[PDB]
Structure formats: C-alpha cells, structure tokens
Amino acid sequence: TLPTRDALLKAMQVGETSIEAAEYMATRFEQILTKAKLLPECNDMLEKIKEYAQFVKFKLLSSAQVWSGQERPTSDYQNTQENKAEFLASHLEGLPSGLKLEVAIGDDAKILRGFSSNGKMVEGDQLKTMDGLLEGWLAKNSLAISGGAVVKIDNTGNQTKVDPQEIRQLINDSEKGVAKYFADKGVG
Amino acid sequence: RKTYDMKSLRAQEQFNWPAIMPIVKEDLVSQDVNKGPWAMALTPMEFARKYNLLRKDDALLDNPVPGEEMTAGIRRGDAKRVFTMQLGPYWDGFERCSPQAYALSAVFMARMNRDRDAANNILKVLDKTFVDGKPDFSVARPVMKKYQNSELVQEVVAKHAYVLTVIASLLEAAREDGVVPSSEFLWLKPVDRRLWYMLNCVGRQTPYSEVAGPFAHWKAEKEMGRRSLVPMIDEAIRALEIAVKEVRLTPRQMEELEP
Amino acid sequence: SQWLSTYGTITAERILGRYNISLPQDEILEAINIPSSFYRHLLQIPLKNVLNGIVIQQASDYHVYAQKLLIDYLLSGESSKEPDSQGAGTRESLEDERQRLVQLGDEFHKLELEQDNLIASSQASLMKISIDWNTKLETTLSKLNSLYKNTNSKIKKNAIRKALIKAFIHCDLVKDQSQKNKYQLIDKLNQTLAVSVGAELKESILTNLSELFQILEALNTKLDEFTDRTNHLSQQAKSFRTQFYEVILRIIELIKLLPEYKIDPAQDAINREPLYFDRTIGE
Amino acid sequence: GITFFGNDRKTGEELWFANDDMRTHALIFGSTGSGKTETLVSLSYNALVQGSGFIYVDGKGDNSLYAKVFSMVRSMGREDDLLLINFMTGARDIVGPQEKRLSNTLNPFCQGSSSMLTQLVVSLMMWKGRAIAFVEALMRLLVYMRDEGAILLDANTIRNYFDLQRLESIVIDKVFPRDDQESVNIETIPKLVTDPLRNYLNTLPGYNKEKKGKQVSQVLEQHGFITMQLVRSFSSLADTYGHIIRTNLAEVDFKDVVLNRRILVVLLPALEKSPDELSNLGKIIVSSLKAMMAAGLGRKPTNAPTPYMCILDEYGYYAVQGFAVVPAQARSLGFSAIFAGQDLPAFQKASKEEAASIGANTNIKICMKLGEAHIFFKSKIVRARMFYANPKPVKQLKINQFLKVEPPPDDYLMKLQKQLASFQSILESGDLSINKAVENEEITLISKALKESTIVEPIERGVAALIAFHGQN
Amino acid sequence: RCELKLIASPGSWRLYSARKIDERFKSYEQKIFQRDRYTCQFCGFQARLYQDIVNLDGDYTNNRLSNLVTACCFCAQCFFVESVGVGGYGGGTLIYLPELTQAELNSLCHVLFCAITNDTGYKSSAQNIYRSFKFRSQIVEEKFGEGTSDPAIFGQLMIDSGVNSEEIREKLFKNIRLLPSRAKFRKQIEKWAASALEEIAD
Ligand SMILES: [Zn+2]
C-alpha cells in the first residue's frame, strides 16, 4: 500500500528535528517503493522526500567550529544558506564555466562580479566584494526582515556563472551574496 | 524365614543387586537436600541464584511478555560463561580421562559389542570397592584395551568433541543393546557430580540444570553430524530465560536484585 | 604517582589546545590534577559542557529511536483501519503520541541550540582570557627579570618562569583571593627559587603581579556565570532523557496492541543497537 | 526369588516371587478401608531396591501419597529419578508465571512416530468407523506437518482442527492456517498425505464443491455425531490442565520412563466423582504407556533383568482396548503391571467386556479381603500379610524442575553447514590469504599521519594523527 | 610489550574466564596492575575501569608473575577471536587493512572513541574515519563468503574446520585486523569518559 499524502506529511513532521530520523524516513520510503511498484510517480514522490532529507540535514547543522569559539549564526536563513555554500561548493562543483560573471546593477553593466575561482571562501570573497560594490552602486534597500533578514527582492540580476549543470555555482553565489543581501530565495 | 522391614530389606538384598551398595550404609532421609554429597539437583531458580545471573529487566531493552511482572531476567554474559565452563575438559584419549570416566567409558564399550558379561562384572565389583573404603577403577582395564578400537566405538567416539559429550553419546548406543538403567551409577554421585547428571539426562529431552552445557551441545552435534571443538551452548542459555520467566517473584525479594 | 586516565589526558589536553595555552610540558600530569590549581579552573567550564555533551547525546538516541517507531507506522497501516473498528480502538491514542513526539522534537531541539550557544559563548571568552594572560605573562616575564637581573643573587630567566608557574599550581588565586593569599604565593615563588628577601621588593613585585591577578580574576566572574548556566542546561537536559524514555516506552506497548500490524525483529534488532547504553550517567 | 511380598499368616515362612511370573501381570481386589494403597507402595519398594522405576497411577484422589513416595525414593538415593504430574490440582488456575512449580509436564504428542493414531483412536475409547477414518488422516497431515512446520502438537493444535472449515481450507484452498497470523502451503507436500482427508468429506452425506456456507449444513449433522467423543475428550484435556500439556519438551515421555527405569507417580482427581472426564484423564496414561510400547518402540535387545512394575490403581475407569497383553517387541523391557480395583463386582461393573481380558491375562490374582489379603495362585492359595513399608515422612518435598533445551534452529545450521563448506574449499586450494588491493582516501590519510609522526607513545601518537587529519580536512 | 596475534585457540576461553572468577587470578590481578600502572602493554591504554590480564605464552594455567601482562579491553578480546561479540560484552568486525599493525589499530581506535564520546570538536572527523574502517569489512566478507565477517563466526569456521598450525593460521589471518566496534562498547566508552571528566572537573 502506498501511504496517503496526509499520513506522509505527518511522517515528515515527526521527523523534522534530527538528521538521522529524516534520512531514515527517506530510506524507508525509497525501500518500500522499490520493493513495491516503484512507479515513475512513485519515483517522483521519492525525489520529493529525498529533497526533504537533504533539506533537514541542510538546515540543522552549521557547527562552524563552535568549539573553536565562533558561534552558530542563529537566524536560520543564514545557517541554511551557509550550509548550502558548503555542500555545493564542496562536493558538486568543479569548473561549471570557468570565470564568467555578469550580475548587473539595475540596467547598468558596470558593477559586475569579477568571475574569480570557485574555491572555498574564494568565490565567497569575490561575491562579497561584488556585493559590496553593488551596494556602492545602490546600498541595501530596507525591504523587510525575518529574524535577521535584509532583502532586495527584485534585485538587479540573478545569474552570474551559469550552465545547465551550474546549479552548484549559481547556488553558491546566491548564498555568499545573500549572507547579507538576499533577493528572498527562501522557502520551506 | 522372618518378617522384614524397609531398612532390613535394604541390607538383605544389596548383595544380589550391587547397584545399591553405595547407599545401604547410609540414612539419607534425615539429611537435607541442597546440602552435602547426596543433594538434589538445582531448579533453574536455585541455580541462577547460586551463580548470580539475575537482573531486573528494563523495558525497551528486553521486551517482557505483557502478562508478566514480579519475575527476573538473566544476564547472558555471565550465563554463557557459566554454561561453557560446564563443558568437560577436551577429549584427547581414553587413556587420558578422569579415573572414573575411564570406568564408565569401559562399561558402555563392552555393551556396544554385546559382550555383556564383560561389562556386568565391571559394575558389580566397582561398588563393592567403593562401599568399602576407596574404589579402584583399575579393575576395568582388560575390557578397555580390548574394544578401544572396535568399529562401532570409533564411529561413536571420533564424532564428538568433549569428554562429557562422548561419554554421554556412547551410552546413547550402549543402551540400544538392551537396557543400561542409570541406577547402576550410584557410586558415581559423590565421587563426581557433573558426570552423574550428564549420564542421567541422556535419554531424556530435558536436562537438569546442573548439566545444561553438555546437554545443549550433545544435541547440537547430534544434529549437525559433526564434531565441533567450540562450545555450542547458544540454546541452553535460551532455555534458562524461559525457565526463569516462570517463577513468580515476591516483591520483597524483587527489589534485592539489581540491573 | 597519581596519573591521569588516558581518556582524560586526550580530553584534558585537547581543550587546552583550543585555548592555545600549552605552557606546561610535563606538569600537565601535576597541574590539571592538583585541586588548588589554576589550569583546572580555566578547564572546569568547558569540561562540564562536555559532560552535558553526552547526556544530550544519550537522550537524543531515544529521540532518534522514537521517531523511527512512528515513521514505520505512519508509512504503512494508518488509514486501512476504518473509523469505528478495533483499528481506531487505540489508533487515536497513537495519533496523540505523534503530537507529543512532535513537540518534544521542537523543544529538545531548542536545547541543542542553547548548548551550542553555551559552548560558543563560553569558549569565545575563555580563549579571550588565556591569550591575554600569555601576553600579560610575557610582560611580567621580562619585567620580573629586570627586577631580578638587578639582584646581586644571580638567577636565570627560564628558571624563574618555571618558578612562577609552580606558584599558581601549588596555591590557587582564582577563587580564594585576598591580600594575604598573594603573600603565600609570593613566599611560594621565593621558596621555589633558592633564596630572596626583598622587603621593599615584596612591595616592588606586588605591583607587577597585578596584571596576572586582574586577568586571573576575570576567570572567577566569568566562572560566576557559566557554572550557573550549566547546571540549568544540564538539569533541563537530564529531564529530556526521562520523558523521551517514556514516549519511547508508551509507544512500544500502545503500538504493540494493533491487530494487523507489527514491528518485525529484523529492523528492530538493528534500530535497537544504539540503545544499549546506561541512563544514570549524570548524577 | 527376587521380589518379596510377604509372610504366610499361618506358619511364618515368607513368600517371594520370581521374575518369570512377576512379568505376568498381577491383579488386586479390595475395599478402600482395607489399606490397599500402602500395598501399592510397599510393593513399589520391592522394585525400587534393585534399580527399576515403578509407575504409580492413583485416581483415589490421594494428595498424601507423593509425600510417602518421595520419602521412599529419597531413601534410595535416586532422588533424581522422579517425575510427578499432578492432575488433582486446579482448573485453569495456572496462567503465566507461578508462585511455585506444581507439576511436571506430560505431552505424548510432540515426538511423533505415527503411532499416536494407535493412541488417539484409543484415547477415543458408520459412526465408530468414520471416527477412526477422520482422525487417522489428520494425524498424517499433522504429524507430517510437525516435522518441518512451526507447529507444536499438543492437546490444542489437534483440538483446534476438529472444526471443519479450517480442515476444509486445507482441502479445497490447499492452504494451511494455524492459531497465529500465518500462511502455510501444502502444495509441495506429497499427495500420500492430503488424499485421505480430501476423500473423507466426500464420504459424508453431502458436499457443495464451491463454498462452505452451504455444505456444512449438509454435513454438520454427521460431522458432529462422529467427531463428538473426541472433541469432548480433547475439550477437558487442553483447558483444565494448561500447566501439564501445553509444553513442547515433555519432562516425562514414556519411552524414556521405561527404557531407563525412571519413576513417575501420577495422581488423578477422583474416580467415583464425575468419571465422565476423570476416567478420561487416567486414560491419556495407559493409552501412551501402551501405544508407545506396542508400535512406537525404536538388532536384538536382550531381556531385562529387572521387572518394571507399573501399578495402576483403578483400571476400572480408564481402559484402552486390550492392555493386559504386551506385544512381542517390548518383551525386552521386562515389563509388568499391577492392576487394581475397588471391587470385582464393580470391576466388571466399571466398563464393558474388560475384566475378562485382565482376568485372562494375569497369572496372579489378588483379593484384599479384610491378615491383609490372600493370593489366588494357580496351584495353591496362600493367606498372608503383605509387605509393610512405612517411609518416614519428609520435611520438604521438592519436585525437581528441568529446562527446555532445543536442538538449534535449522535456519542456522543449514547456514553453518553452508559456510563451512565454502570455507573448507578455500582452505584446501591453498590460495587462502587475502590479496586484492583496495585504496581509500581516508585509510591512506590516517596512515600517512601515523607514519610521519615521531612521538613514540602509541596513544599520544594516535591523537596527533587525528589532529593532523582533521586540520587536513 | 609483545605484539598481537589473533589466536583462534579452541579452549583458552574456558580456562581464561575460569580463572577470572577465582582469587588466584585475582590476588595476582592486583599485584600485576600495580607493577604496570594499569597501562595497556600492547596498545598503550591507561585507565582504571575494565582492564584484565592476558597470558603471553598461549597457556592460561601457568600464572607466574612474569608471563602475565595487563592489556586493555580491546586487546584482550583480540586474543580470543574464536568468540567475541558473544561472550557478554566486547564486539568487533574483521576488516582488511594492511597499513596499520594491529596495535596501531587498537590504539588509534581509542582516540576515535574519545573524540566521539566526549566531543571536543573533532567529532565530525572521527566518524568520517571510522566510516572507512567498518566499510572495509565487506572485502573480508567477499573472500570468505557472506555472514562470516564477524569474528565470532570467522573464528568458528577455523577450529571447527580443524586448523592449528602456526603457519596455516598465520597465512590465513594475514592482513586482517580486528576493528573494535563502537556500538557494542558503549557501556564502556562512556563509563571511561564520564569517569574521566568527573575526576578532573569537580
Ligand atoms: Zn590494549
């Protein structure tokens, strides 16, 4: 029997705390789909809760060397976006398109990212400098908040180093720029 | 001819049936069970208490049958140690065994090859030496050397592992040539214990609890059909759990035992 | 000769590593053991954190097992029981427990986040304490020399540094602080070295050991807080190990009595592997 | 002689008996105020003093007998040779745990040699013929299914199948249900076993081939009138005694209790009160102690030198067809029996056509006319007091508990004999050490640290490896 | 300070435990610990709780004060590979790694339990290493067949199949190290740790 949507959302909500439980539910539903039917529709339901498991592990862990004396940024937008940066710039990104960056500033092509390397805090540094320069062109417009949040919702440009497989690169750039200035690519 | 009684009968007819010599000079009745040489076996309770196996079972770790409370649970780690220790020494050679286990190896051997009057005179004298001082098992060599390599015995004896299991599994066959009632081993009860309960269990399908190591093995390798020098007592543990969730425990002694 | 357990020495050393204060080479056997020490006090705030670092780990094992019992349930046999049957006979009493396990999920999780702040907030300071000791130790280091190089009594430099460290390790000035206790220290630094008098020099040094004693003191007042927060954060945490052990126990008999569902000994025997610890490890 | 009975009342010269006669059964007649129970005990000494386990069956409702015997055995050292199954105890008062162990467990249905048909038909006691036909076929269906299925025979799992639809579901659906959530199949089993039952319902007056809702009323008239004596027989045995028969490994199984000279005192509730189900409880014994001696006895065992005298106290009430004759097989057992009864006029009155069988098969006949008795021998009649054994009573009467061990599960040995085979082939070929090279990125980076570091003490060396590896990533 | 050899000896446990309850293996048990400072002579461990003494000579009758040595709770079970993971506590999983002498695996596996139990910051790394020790076990299961990874079993198939030689035993245990599993040593690796952090931090 394929569990019904309500039973399934209940199963999600009982496993929204710990990484282990959410991953275990992901494994379970994969398992009892492939043992059973494993329809393409079942394949899509599986993809959805795979996204779920990734996102739980993705928004419950930035130790950030807490013992070393730093702190876990507690606005859970930034925690999640920094683990974004870490995962994607870590194990899904190598040369998506070497050195391309055109993120304009409101129909002006001057304030654009330098298209540096995508190394750890390297592309992060490039995006920090580029976001600072974009602020110089027009500083952080007070849009709203959510905990600690600042927005340029319809900001200038989204895509900087893009390609069909450039999910890692584009998402890393969004994270390192939305550490401060976020166009509100935030859901749940 | 003159009237008789319970006692004087025990003396008048202990010659002709010598398997009761080792008792006729005693009066066991006033003595107490659980103390001395002539002491009853241990129930699984009075056992796990003697070897301190008990523990009050915490839920989620060993799910109890819901209808059960005011009982116990036994520690696997010290149970499996106490049962293994009950397996006899290894078996290396008939000439290398306990000086009594060498005179009950012999009796079955004479019996397997049907040469009955050879076996009988072993046991008939073997008590008369025990009832009088110290018994000598060197009255049973000339049978032991003769059949030490008859075809049946080597078939029975090359098949097993430990010297309790063999001495038991020998009997399993030597009784097939008639009857070897375990009442002819009453010189055996004081001079040895772990044996007298291995012999006295074979033929049953439930052992005592003094000897459940050997009996769980003796069935394990009578199943595979293969010797196994390890211990295989993974079952005699499981039997003890089943026969300890049977005695209901009073609350006062419930709380003395600790997890 | 009063050694230190090699589970301790790994942890007791590696904490000092985070603080970058490995001044002792071999005294680590006698320093972080002697009760009236000073590296012990710099150590007693992050250590207890680690002690709550396992209790909020044991509890979060029940919590991990607790979600699994329900995740198995919620995926298979939830709706196949019609309302008004034996199916809803205890099922409603289960769909209660899902609610209780979903609040203890998002309250307990608030405990981890307060922990991770407590460690962060704590270490972030005690580091700011130790290094500022090192620097201020360096200045007294040189300055105490200029007060001792002037001595007609010839003494070295590294000899005196090893002399002072033993004054903080043979007496404490972290908690029982006074104006006479410093003199027991001052008479303990002198006696470790061979001989000195310096009656005005006993004054002439008191002004110099100040920056230690000050920077020492910001250990007491910052040990004023953190211990007060840690017993809380441990009393709260010890609780969560109990009332998970209940929700994990209530479910194992409530779910036990379904007619047409069961938990097989296959997945249970493997889910029940990390549940063989002890409970009574904090008090 | 070997066995002592007593001294002539007239003259004063004792009368023994010898093995050849005593192997022929004995038979005692006497009132209940005559003192006949001590004579069942005193003459059980005569067979304990030489290593021979009497079986003692009492349906006089005596509770103060097992105190006598355990004060008799214990006096002969072989206190380990005693089993006690007690039926005069409560009715379904035993559930789960127990404050103290009360009785041993008897279960003649577990180790199956397909002689139980010989006993189930006699524990029973066209209609009588169709009764034997129905049961015989289930036993093969069940005793077979026990050899491999997770089915423990007892007075229940057979009693559970006396209904028709679960029997029929074996037939038409060819699937095997039990008293658990389960699905068992009889398709692979040879048809030598399903066939007799399949053709049984067909010999009933009615059958509806598709469904059961119709055909039961076609047959429930005759199904009831043929299965009735057994399902009532099984009804008492499985619920009034759940601490005796619901076991798996009987402490007392009668092939042992004779072939080894063990003792077994058993006590039955009473036999002048409701014999409808207490003359059925003393027949689960003489059924088994007969149908495991005639046809179930597992190249030529010798004649025993010890008579094993089983003493039966009221053979009027229980009885199975022709017990006093013992077949040519078990002559090796050196067997005998001492039938007992309240009164000869009652002995016939007890049941049909039976006191002659015992009257024709016993060379010894005993009247205990109120000088305790006289002996009715073929040649001369002798009047004599019998033996009087007066066991001093025992302070504490422990019935020795056992365990329930098992041959290990076959889900585990067939694996063990399977790996040993594959591990045996490896160890002979000679290419036994592991050889293939695998490379991890972490075993390399945790060994590269342990080889470069120079600190000798192994633990301190270890943590330095973990430091450098962590700082590496 | 000898090295470890995974001795699959048939009847050493019977004697080894047998002594453990007596006093002669106990009266000595105090005498030998003092001489050796509760230090584990095989792998370097140094702790008070749960340490027991192994015999070097392969025999457990002769308990003189010189042949006996004191060794931690991971090495002791490494001397009886014919049953471990069954005899109460203790556990393991045979793996195939040649890069580390068996001592350099016991000792290195302690440090991976004192940085996973009492997390001091390296818990992220320690599990990553330990992930790659257990995972090797699927090779010693590929050569010798399924279900005989666990030393409780792979020990069983030896003396049940009758091998005794110092040679055919050695060549068979070549390049196999006994990785002590965390999840069965949990009643300990926390008892040692929590006892450590309570002496220091009072
Ligand atoms: Zn060690």
Author numbering:
A (entry chain E): 5 to 192
B (entry chain B): 122 to 380
C (entry chain D): 11 to 293
D (entry chain A): 104 to 228, 239 to 411, 424 to 495, 556 to 658
E (entry chain C): 7 to 208
Paper lines:
Integrated into the inner membrane, the T4CC is a multiprotein effector recruitment platform comprising different effector binding sites and an AAA+ ATPase called DotL. The structure revealed that the T4CC is made of two parts linked by the C‐terminal tail of DotL (DotLCter): the hetero‐pentameric core composed of the DotL ATPase domain, DotM, DotN, DotY, and DotZ (referred to as “DotLMNYZ core”), and the flexible IcmSW module composed of IcmS and IcmW (Kwak et al., 2017; Meir et al., 2020; Vincent et al., 2012).
Here, we further investigate the function of DotY and DotZ proteins. First, we obtained a near‐atomic resolution cryo‐EM map that includes the middle domain of DotY previously missing. In the T4CC structure, DotY interacts exclusively with DotZ, which would explain why DotY would depend on DotZ to co‐purify with the other T4CC components. For DotY, most residues are not conserved. DALI (Holm, 2020) analysis shows that DotY and DotZ do not belong to any structural or functional family. Further analysis reveals that the trajectory of the IcmSW module is modified by DotY/Z, thereby suggesting the likely function of these proteins.
